[PDB]
């Protein structure tokens, strides 16, 4: 699906230019769990922002499902961003005056599916994550990880093509983060939906199939895992990070 070809961005404030993206080649097929990580002042965040439609492009070509995006219109870009490309944010971004059901079912109002198909799909989506008990509780009495799980459920409603995750496990303990990662892996294995995550935690990258070690806008190859044990892959990633 995703096809990045030498996408490059230059940071300019009309007086100084400091390019951060110099040479990108990403090959992503339908149905994998990849991760982007490396350093702390690199262009990985900018890479994720330019891969999606949240930020513009400077020099490069990106194709998602065959569609052209680099020279695509603004209104059509917004329509595409609303129709596909579900997002999971670092923070909760949950409305306080509504409930869980309204919060995770509102983005389905634009495409009218009546009061039958939406209500049938909400149960299916929310029972996989095990939040069906939380159908009328306002998002101020529930725990921490349940809000993130509701956000993921909202991102998983309309069956999008590509899901971009920007540091999901950032403000959670070990148990909640592990449970959320396991649920995301189960959802990936159930329905074919590509998931891309940017994280700083080796445990988060352990659940992934591929990882890219960005280095100030370079490649430094990548891992493949495949027929490899979870723990052994964890030590391999730890060694690779220790090399850096």
């Amino acid at each position: 699906i995703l096809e990045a070809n030498k996408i490059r961005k230059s940071y300019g404030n009309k007086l100084n230019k400091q390019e951060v993206l110099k040479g990108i080649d990403i090959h992503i097929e339908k149905g994998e769990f990849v991760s982007i990580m490396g350093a702390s002042g690199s262009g990985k965040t900018t890479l994720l922002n330019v891969l999606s439609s949240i930020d513009q492009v400077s020099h490069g070509t990106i194709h998602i499902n065959g569609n052209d995006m680099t020279a695509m219109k603004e209104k059509q870009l917004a329509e595409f961003r609303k129709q596909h490309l579900g997002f999971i944010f670092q923070d909760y971004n949950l409305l306080d005056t509504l409930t869980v059901k309204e919060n995770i079912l509102l983005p389905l109002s634009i495409t009218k599916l009546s009061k039958k198909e939406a209500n049938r799909k909400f149960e299916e989506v929310a029972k996989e994550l095990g939040i069906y008990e939380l159908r009328d509780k306002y998002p101020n009495e529930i725990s921490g990880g349940q809000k993130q799980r509701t956000s993921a459920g909202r991102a998983f409603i309309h069956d999008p093509s590509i899901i971009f995750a920007d540091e999901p496990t950032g403000a959670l303990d070990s148990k909640s983060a592990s449970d959320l990662l396991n649920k995301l892996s189960q959802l990936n294995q159930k329905r074919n939906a590509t998931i891309i995550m940017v994280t700083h935690d080796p445990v988060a990258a352990s659940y992934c199939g591929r990882v890219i070690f960005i280095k100030d806008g370079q490649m430094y190859t990548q891992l493949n895992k495949g027929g490899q044990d979870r723990q052994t892959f964890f030590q391999d990633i730890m060694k690779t990070q220790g090399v850096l």
């Binding site: 917004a78 609303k82 944010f89 005056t97 309204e102 079912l105 509102l106 109002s109 009061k115 909400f122």
Partner: protein
């Protein structure tokens, strides 16, 4: 450095609050115009029943009582919005006197620079107000006027006196300020509150429906019923906001379950928690708006039906009480080349029994049913009907009478003669009028009997209830001509003005009700502007108090063009609920008061509500225009 800060603050405040300056200018101009109108010696040509020079004196007091309240209230939100600005100065370190001086040095300019334009605009409106008044009433021409320095003195004194109250309030707020001050599920009592809020209004409407022509009729008893209705309709309106819109909104919300849309999220999140907080200002706005609309419509009904009431009061174009004046009038008209069709008809006053024809109660009497005074005429005089023996036909319509004095079908009517009683029966009711209101008591229609029966009725002539003149000498007129000179001749005929003319009776009522028209219309326009400005100012807080919801909605995929529609349909309800309640109050108030101010309705009521809504929609549009700015800057 202080001067730059003061200038910048003045420039910023001249842009956020401009409706305030507009309202100040409008109020000052209207007050100056009214005072100049009152003190000028030119309104002496407009007089029907009241002097006029004293009505303006009363109308110039309520305007001040409204404007002062508006200013003293709307200059409190302005000082409350500066709450997180005095603490910073106190942290930096300033005496309270410096803060007071800084705050006052801007208000002085922003107030006097508008007061000096409001007075200068009184000249352009002083003559136009006279033109409007002279067009509503009938008068010939001409209006010159002069400076009327008394008006300037009075206006300056009043609008400088208000500023001292403003300043003392601001000083009290500054001193009262703290040292720094810088750091749900439904209940069951609200169930009863929401039930009562609708029950009281509905029962008030139902009771007000049967006020006139009902089971109770007494001058000392209708006062209590009126007070009860006017208390119920107010208590219900007050309870309708503080715990009755929440019920309706909760019922609506618990009807869709899950799936919703951004068109309803903003409304269902804001209306319930915002309309409850302000549930004393909206009550006042709705009540005063209903009171103004009802009074204007009730005056315009009478102004519309005066031309028909005058024609109904007198059967012909001229009426006389003595033969001498009638023959003098016709002698004068003889050489005036204005031929007249003069017909005379004697009237024999008599009383009968109409107890059996009552469809209601003896309380609806307006006179003893068995001994009610009526008028009797023969049949040869009438050129439209030819009655027979044992038949009595009524005349006239009297739309008020049909609502009170309801008549049954045929029956038996007893003639209360001196020593005899000949019974007849009720044939039917005509529509035209045959006898002026002088000889028919209040409004009781005259009866028509057979010529043969009248041949003995006039012979009897019971001399107990006979009036001074048992004749209806009346001089009609030919086809359309110069009736103005005929009216002038009639006026010069009666030096003691002891006769009746159609034109005079129409003009008197027209002028008397046009004066009230002008006063109430202007005093209602002022309140409309005031209420619109207050509501627009109150709507400014929601913009700044809802930004950390637009900044989140725009990060989910929505665009400004999709939020603006929800904003529009939220502002629609927010600005429309009080207007709808006021319209309902006015409609159910007028419908219990017609058939008493004259004839036709549904002509003025819509013609007033349409204008009111058209002049009320502007602030609703401006609120959305303001929301667009904060929406654009949400990101």
């Amino acid at each position: 450095n202080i001067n730059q800060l003061i200038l910048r603050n003045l420039k910023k405040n001249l842009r956020n609050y401009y409706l305030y300056v507009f309202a100040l200018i409008f109020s000052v101009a209207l007050y100056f115009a009214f005072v100049t109108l009152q003190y000028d010696p030119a309104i002496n040509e407009v007089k029907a029943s009241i002097k006029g020079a004293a009505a303006i004196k009363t109308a110039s007091i309520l305007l001040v009582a409204v404007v002062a309240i508006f200013i003293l209230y709307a200059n409190t939100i302005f000082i409350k919005r500066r709450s997180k600005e005095i603490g910073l100065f106190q942290l930096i370190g300033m005496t309270k006197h410096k803060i007071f001086r800084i705050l006052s040095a801007e208000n002085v300019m922003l107030y006097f620079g508008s007061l000096a334009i409001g007075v200068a605009a009184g000249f352009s409106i002083s003559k136009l107000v006279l033109m409007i008044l002279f067009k509503i009433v009938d008068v010939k021409a001409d209006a010159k006027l002069h400076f009327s320095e008394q008006a300037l003195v009075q206006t300056v004194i009043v609008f400088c006196g208000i500023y001292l109250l403003i300043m003392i309030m601001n000083y009290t707020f500054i001193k009262k300020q703290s040292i720094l001050s810088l750091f749900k599920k439904i209940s069951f009592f609200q169930m009863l509150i929401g039930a009562l809020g609708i029950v009281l209004i509905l029962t008030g409407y139902y009771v007000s429906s049967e006020l006139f022509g009902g089971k109770f009729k007494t001058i000392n008893e209708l006062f209590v019923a009126m007070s009860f209705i006017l208390g119920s309709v107010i208590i219900g309106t007050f309870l309708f906001y503080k715990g009755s819109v929440t019920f309706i909104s909760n019922i609506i919300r618990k009807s869709k379950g899950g799936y919703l849309n951004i068109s309803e999220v903003l409304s269902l999140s804001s209306i319930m928690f915002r309309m409850k907080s302000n549930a004393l200002l909206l009550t006042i706005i709705t009540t005063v708006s209903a009171l103004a609309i009802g009074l204007l419509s009730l005056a315009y009904i009478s102004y519309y039906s005066s031309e028909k009431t005058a024609e109904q009061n007198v059967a012909a174009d001229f009426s006389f009480m003595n033969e001498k004046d009638a023959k003098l009038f016709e002698n004068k008209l003889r050489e005036s080349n204005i031929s007249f069709v003069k017909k005379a008809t004697p009237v024999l006053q008599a009383n009968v029994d109409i107890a059996n024809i009552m469809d209601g109660t003896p309380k609806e009497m307006q006179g003893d049913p068995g001994n009610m005074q009526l008028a009797v005429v023969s049949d040869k005089d009438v050129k439209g009907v030819d009655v027979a023996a044992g038949e009595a036909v009524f005349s006239g319509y009297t739309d008020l009478l049909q609502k009170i004095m309801v008549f049954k079908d045929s029956g038996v009517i007893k003639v209360k003669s001196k020593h005899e009683t000949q019974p007849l029966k009720y044939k039917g009711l005509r529509e035209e009028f045959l006898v002026s209101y002088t000889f028919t008591s209040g409004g009781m229609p005259a009866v028509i009997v057979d010529d043969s029966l009248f041949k003995q009725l006039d012979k009897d002539k019971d001399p107990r209830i006979q009036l001074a003149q048992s004749t209806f000498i009346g001089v009609n007129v030919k086809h359309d001509d110069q009736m103005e000179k005929a009216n002038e001749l009639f006026q010069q005929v009666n030096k003691k003005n002891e006769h009746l003319s159609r034109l005079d009776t129409s003009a008197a009522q027209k002028s008397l009700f046009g004066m009230v028209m002008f006063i109430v219309g202007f005093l209602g326009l002022t309140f409309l502007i005031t209420s619109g400005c207050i509501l627009y100012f109150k709507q400014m807080g929601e913009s700044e108090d809802e930004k950390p919801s637009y900044t989140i909605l725009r990060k989910l995929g929505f665009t400004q063009g999709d939020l603006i529609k929800g904003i529009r349909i939220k502002q629609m309800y927010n600005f429309g609920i009080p207007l709808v309640v006021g319209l309902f109050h006015s409609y159910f108030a007028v419908q219990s008061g017609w058939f008493l101010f004259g004839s036709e309705v549904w002509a003025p009521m819509i013609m007033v509500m349409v204008l009111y809504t058209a002049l009320y929609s502007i602030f609703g549009f401006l609120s959305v225009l303001y929301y667009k700015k904060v929406i654009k800057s949400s990101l």
